[PDB]
Amino acid sequence: VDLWQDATAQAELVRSGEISRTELLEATIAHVQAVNPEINAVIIPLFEKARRESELASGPFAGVPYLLKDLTVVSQGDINTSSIKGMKESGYRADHDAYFVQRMRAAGFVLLGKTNTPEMGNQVTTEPEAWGATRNPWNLGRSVGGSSGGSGAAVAAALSPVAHGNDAAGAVRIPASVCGVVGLKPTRGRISPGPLVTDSDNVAGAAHEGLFARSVRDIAALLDVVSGHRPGDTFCAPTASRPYAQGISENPGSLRVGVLTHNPVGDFALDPECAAAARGAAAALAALGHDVNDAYPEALGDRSFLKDYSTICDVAIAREIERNGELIGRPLTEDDVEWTSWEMVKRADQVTGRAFAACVDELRYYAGKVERWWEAGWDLLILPTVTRQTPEIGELMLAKGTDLEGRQSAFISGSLQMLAFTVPFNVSGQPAISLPIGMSSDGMPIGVQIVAAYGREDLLLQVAAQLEGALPWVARRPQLLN
């Protein structure tokens, strides 16, 4: 069984009869057992559940395995740590299935296990104290990005053809860029993170559930599976007229495309190789007939909003520490979490109701400034997913002694460059996808990001499909896989 086939092809091999559900599953489990030890991607294997669901699985993807991030969404009866030391020791297990999980099972997917993440998803690298660092299949001494680093690495190493993750500042797109896979943060309100309400209304709407895959068609199919308004969902996205798996092949025509190949904020230089990858993709779109120009939302030249976002994040983590404490029946202390997280507890205590409300308003205002660019006639923005070369393991984790006065550790220097080009779209809520189109001169994947207007995943997946055909990446594989 060639596990390098995408989810759609793997589903067909089972439907066709070529392969059995047990063969694919067992072939996948064996692969996981052999390769995962080297990357520490899957932290909680669920082979037994995967085996039970496989026998009962039914639908367009019956028998196809997938991985779930151990954050936000939960699976009934399974361990849930959110990479919190105090929670891992408690042996806590969730009592229900998140809507996302139910939707996947009904589609025929089998829950193979959970993937690693930094504590409560508070970093753009995946090196939690609780589970250890997740390493890059392309280079074991390198980070896999974060916070959905385990899912990104898992898919890159073929531990599964698709996986789940979430994105509040680029947590799906970043790991995708760094690990050479496709990562989509859909329009705000596209995918339900319920029935639970976590992270203070999902970080005031900035946190989106996202998807990982190696093909654009797999992403389109996944959207058809997990999208839609569910009871209690705060946000909602515009409805598509046709299923995404069908519209992906439609010709969008010549679109107004703007390309960004420098850091508009001017507080650091965009890595030349990252810029060249985006430029190359822009050239391919021009060759395809689009109206490509050097242009971008002027709002991107401002990152003042990040200060306001950080304040909201302080409150969200603080209350999340509280929520997890309740799950086990006892308050969590400075000894149950990482020092970076505990520091936010104190900061949260100094945030007033009026201040919190003002910060949220600042996000809405910024979102408006950003979206006005599309309002003015532009259809898509092309830009690098990340702005720097991939960091080495350990590089982004700051020593407890370190003094990062006032702001999120992920929003400073080395970490800032990982999320500077992704976070603006968590604020605007626009659909944004990272495609594994580039490679660094030293063999590390470089993602190219495409952003469409609010709710226009249809156009986004259409152009992504064109780029997939113009600059195919399927031929490239991490050294971990020989």
Ligand X SMILES: O=C1CCCCCNC(=O)CCCCCN1
Window 22 to 51, contacts with ligand X (CB under 6 A): none
410 is an interface residue for ligand X by CB under 6 A = yes
Residue 118 or 455: the one with the smaller Cβ distance to ligand X is 118
Least distance between ligand X and beta carbon 71 (Å): 7
* Cα torsion 340, 341, 346, 351: sign: positive
Figure out which of the listed residues 147, 192, 462, 466 binds ligand X, where binding follows CB under 6 A.
147
DSSP string for 364-417: HHHHHHHHHHHHTT--EEEEES-SSPPPBTTSS---TT----SS-GGGSHHHHH
Contact 210, 164 (CB under 8 A): yes
Which string of x and - marks every residue 231-270 that binds ligand X (by CB under 6 A)? ----------------------------------------
Residue appearing with tokens 């996000």: 363
417 is an interface residue for ligand X by CB under 6 A = no
Figure out which of the listed residues 57, 184, 274, 316 binds ligand X, where binding follows CB under 6 A.
316
Strand order in the sheet with 445-452: 42-45, 110-115, 65-69, 162-167, 208-213, 182-185, 432-439, 445-452, 380-384, 256-259, 291-294
Secondary structure of residue 139 in the 3-state scheme: strand
- Residue showing the smallest CB distance to ligand X in the complex: 121
Under 8 Å CB-to-CB from 9, ≥6 apart: which residues? none
Number of residues located near ligand X, criterion CB under 6 A: 19
Which string of x and - marks every residue 109-128 that binds ligand X (by CB under 6 A)? ------------xx-x----
CA distance 170 to 174: 5
Query: Phi and psi at residue 357, in whole multiples of 5°?
Result: -60, -40
Q: 192 to each of 45, 58, 479, how far by Cα in Å?
A: 24, 22, 36
Amino acid at 62: A
Residue 209 or 379: the one with the smaller Cβ distance to ligand X is 209
Least distance between ligand X and beta carbon 144 (Å): 13
Figure out which of the listed residues 42, 169, 381, 459 binds ligand X, where binding follows CB under 6 A.
169
Residue 170 or 186: the one with the smaller Cβ distance to ligand X is 170
Residue 31 or 323: the one with the smaller Cβ distance to ligand X is 323
Residue appearing with tokens 């660092």: 133
Strand partners, 139: 136
Which span (133-141, 311-319, 369-377, 388-396) binds ligand X, by CB under 6 A? 311-319
Which string of x and - marks every residue 77-106 that binds ligand X (by CB under 6 A)? ------------------------------
Q: Which two tokens stand for residue 275?
A: 């810029």
Figure out which of the listed residues 7, 79, 313, 420 binds ligand X, where binding follows CB under 6 A.
313
Which span (97-105, 162-170, 355-363, 469-477) binds ligand X, by CB under 6 A? 162-170
Contact 417, 388 (CB under 8 A): yes
Residue 338 or 458: the one with the smaller Cβ distance to ligand X is 338
Least distance between ligand X and beta carbon 388 (Å): 15
Which span (166-174, 353-361, 366-374, 386-394) binds ligand X, by CB under 6 A? 166-174
Window 273 to 302, contacts with ligand X (CB under 6 A): none
CA distance 208 to 171: 9
Which span (83-91, 253-261, 312-320, 347-355) binds ligand X, by CB under 6 A? 312-320
Strand partners, 44: 114
6 is an interface residue for ligand X by CB under 6 A = no
199 is an interface residue for ligand X by CB under 6 A = yes
DSSP string for 36-88: HHHH--EEEE-HHHHHHHHHH--STTTT-EEEEESSSS--TTSB--TT-HHHH
Which span (167-175, 287-295, 368-376, 448-456) binds ligand X, by CB under 6 A? 167-175
203 is an interface residue for ligand X by CB under 6 A = yes
Residue 158 or 416: the one with the smaller Cβ distance to ligand X is 416
166 is an interface residue for ligand X by CB under 6 A = yes
How many CB atoms within 10 Å of residue 217? Answer: 20
Residue 373 or 425: the one with the smaller Cβ distance to ligand X is 425
Least distance between ligand X and beta carbon 412 (Å): 11
Residue appearing with tokens 């702001």: 407
Q: 185 to each of 236, 373, 404, how far by Cα in Å?
A: 14, 19, 29
171 is an interface residue for ligand X by CB under 6 A = yes
408 is an interface residue for ligand X by CB under 6 A = yes
Figure out which of the listed residues 255, 317, 437, 452 binds ligand X, where binding follows CB under 6 A.
317
Under 8 Å CB-to-CB from 352, ≥6 apart: which residues? none
Least distance between ligand X and beta carbon 53 (Å): 27
Residues making contact with ligand X (CB under 6 A):
121-122, 124, 146-147, 166-171, 199, 203, 207, 313, 316-317, 408, 410
